[PDB]
Amino acid sequence: REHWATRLGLILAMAGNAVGLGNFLRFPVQAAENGGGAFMIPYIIAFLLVGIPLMWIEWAMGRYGGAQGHGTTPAIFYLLWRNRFAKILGVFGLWIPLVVAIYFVYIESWTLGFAIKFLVGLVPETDPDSILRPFKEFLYSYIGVPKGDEPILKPSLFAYIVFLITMFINVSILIRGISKGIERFAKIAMPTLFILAVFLVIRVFLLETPNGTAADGLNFLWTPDFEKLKDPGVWIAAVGQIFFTLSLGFGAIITYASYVRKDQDIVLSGLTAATLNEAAEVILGGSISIPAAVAFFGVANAVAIAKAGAFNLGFITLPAIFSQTAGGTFLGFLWFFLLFFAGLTSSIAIMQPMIAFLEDELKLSRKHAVLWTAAIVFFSAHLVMFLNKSLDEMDFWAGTIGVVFFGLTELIIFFWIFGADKAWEEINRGGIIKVPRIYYYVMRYITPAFLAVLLVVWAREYIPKIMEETHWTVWITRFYIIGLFLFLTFLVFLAERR
Template identity: 45%
Template sequence: MAKHERWASRIGLVLAMAGNAVGLGNFLRFPAQAAQNGGGAFMIPYLVSLLVMGIPLMWIEWTMGRYGGSLGHHSTPGIFQSMGKSRAWKYLGVLGLLTCLGIASYYLYIESWCLSYAIYSLLGGFGADEPASFFGRITGQSDNQLFAFSIPGLVMFAICIGINIFILSRGVSGGIEVVAKVAMPLLLLFGVVLAVRGLMSDPISDEAVKESPWVGLNYIWSVPDFTQIANPAVWLAAAGQIFFTLSIGMGSIHCYASYLRKKDDVALTGATTAWTNQMCEVVIGSALLLPIAVSYLGLQGVKDSVAGGSGFGLAFFTLPTLFNNWGPQFAPLAGFLWFGLLFLAAITSSLAMGQPVMAFLEDEFKLSRVKASWALMGMLLFLAVPVALIHEQGVFSDFDFWVGTFALVVFALMEVILFAWAFGMDKGWEELTRGAELKVPRAFFYIMKYVTPTFIIVILLAAIFKPSVGWDGFFGSIGSGQGVPAWEWDADSVIGKILHKDLVTPEDASPEVVTYYENLRTVRTYDRIGLLAIFAFFSILVAIAWRRKGKGGTPS
């Protein structure tokens, strides 16, 4: 059963945890956020957020996981209940299962795109206009069409789900750890090869090169736009990136840490995992997308192309064509290395999303590993099929916001309150430092108790009440003496999402377009009901499991 599983080696644990954290956000979202928010100036709030929120939450989740695992719990309902006296904690812990399952439902879809692009690149590469048309072929998406259908895309999606389920069925040490030991070194190798080649582009000898790739690198490290530091939006973007990059605020770290022994170190291992992730993001991530793109598009061209802040279009539509400048022999290989890197980053993260759900079923309902994997696949398909068959503006983007963004912040706030206030900071500190080979600075005792929750509350409130002019525009108007601007909800705010502000029907739209937007709003209403239904479903399972255990609440 799951409670008897252990990591086979410390290096395997670190690589698996790093694989959980190192995902698509390291190589797509981070460069885009840096380019959009002042380059090197973005790194200042980024590092501050890492120190006062990222590292503390990482240690909190590692400590909670090891503590719950020592009592036989390997998923957040049991881990939360083991640390809090109120019976409500186990139901709040259900959010850890919902986020993992919800994110996996669309993350696996992106994973299938990466695999499709990698294979296609290796078979010959992309022409000048092919990446966008290829994306349409594998997703079946077209403008103003609600439903999307692509047999090749669905086949690749099914293959990726099958690969994940098979690996998970092999167990923690026999499946996840084995994959991490292969995938993480390969990922680093692919990244280094691309970064070195990208930095070799020369505007003097190659007329296709508009600017030196070092301009892109220097934008992050040497020539920051310090006027952006006073911009609240930059701080919010930096804090949001920390959630994305460390995979905090969901149940995966708790689950992985629960397979440690009671005195296994969590302080040094947790810090090592965080720094490994940061190396992949800050060092390799910053040396890939921006320098290569700046070479052929120019710095301003790159800024314009990442206006949305995701880097998706640049990575999937633009970069494959830029590789053509590297010659007909190397371009297909470069495309394979790039999308292979993204696939490896994605699969090590998606495995971490599936494991908590399987652990819950194994712990609480005594399912075998194989049966739990089949149950996970059934749950995944319930959410993943709508993701694949409806335009990405519908279920895909809605899931990304509610379970992939908003829920992470809510969950992080709950866990820091549980750890520092319900469980108690004194007991929490004792758990964190037990068996620690790293001396954790005492300052983090107070950071975890006061600064981290305050920081998260500010982020949460800013996300809920964000005005249409942005917080920078809002405070800028007040500071310049123009008074308080007229209030409108931003389309990306929590309230704006509830009101479908990001799905406003364009003026003078045709009846077909009007119907499309009406259908999208209807779909989003139903997908939110679906997420609530999944939460209720897991809550019912928790109630049944704890009733079977009796008052003690520990596995029999």
């Protein structure tokens, strides 16, 4: 069983997973909507009481299972809890990252396609509409947003061909394994990623128009209202953001950690990776989108831009903004090339869990594990590419509800069923530094309490709407992803039989 070649490689790979489009798109929007600078108070608390502890736990559960030749939760859950039901709950550790990869690699391909377009100068060229319109029409023609009643997407041939190229790039990295593939790429992509971010931050900071300056936007995202704190919605928003940004509950971290040597440090290493992500989010991420947008639209509208959604901000607003500044074309290319590496380092992280299962449990060669996974993903993605709101449906069940539920699940199994003391000693073993003793109570009582509340709130507020309001096409996806869970349950069955 392969291991991470170096300490740095491990950290850069883990950090690579956490760092994502959310650092540059979702955070600025969430921060601006939930109290600006005041949002940092719940954000930091959530990072301490939910973010870090759960990360250490996943890291530990991964390294624990790896020592016995297991990198996926169906097996690992069974180790921590010898019970038939534990293996089924573990199937989610395969289902979640798989379903997410089905629509995420496609979303990822978009950024590449835009990057290719901006690079070739094939991008489109008064009021805020005649400037945004050419780009909205560009995006909708790309991903094939329906101009008719039918719930059918009509992706451009270019969009489709780019998805194949993106799938290929992913396979090229994964098929080389952990150290010679994921790790080797991580050591290159991460520095590259931070260089593009910093460069953009600087270039954006030098933006000025009669309507506002980039510094204005910075003096808005960080000017604390301190009145939203009373609103419990902000605390829920903060815990959510923290949970999403650290990529917790995907089972991806567990799989990555399973390649860590049995008593190699995970406390300091995990803390480092998490810090890299928080720097790329609050410092780098929260200094490109909003500031650049505010620079042109003005301090005024600041709310609207954030409210307009995290997606419209990155794929419509900014590109149009760039096409207005000098040399903004090359500037927009750097933006999407940044978002592409951001996604590329994460897509390989969520496709690995499936690969690991095939290797460890079904004893497939890396080549066969990677290709078969690639096939399952590529095929399944056609449902997301051609069926409207399919992406949204998957993102909710797996990428939203699923991740939180699974997060609370793995925490209860490891710290309650497995044993609080045993779990604590497992986490700290080999640690360059020891986990603060206070965290023993946090992990055992606090962390699970926050997650339970986040689930109860998101459930009572989201599920009834999804079940009733949504179009009937929604079932074609539900049917398919339910089938995927049944499929994985069958593979786990065959694994135990062999």
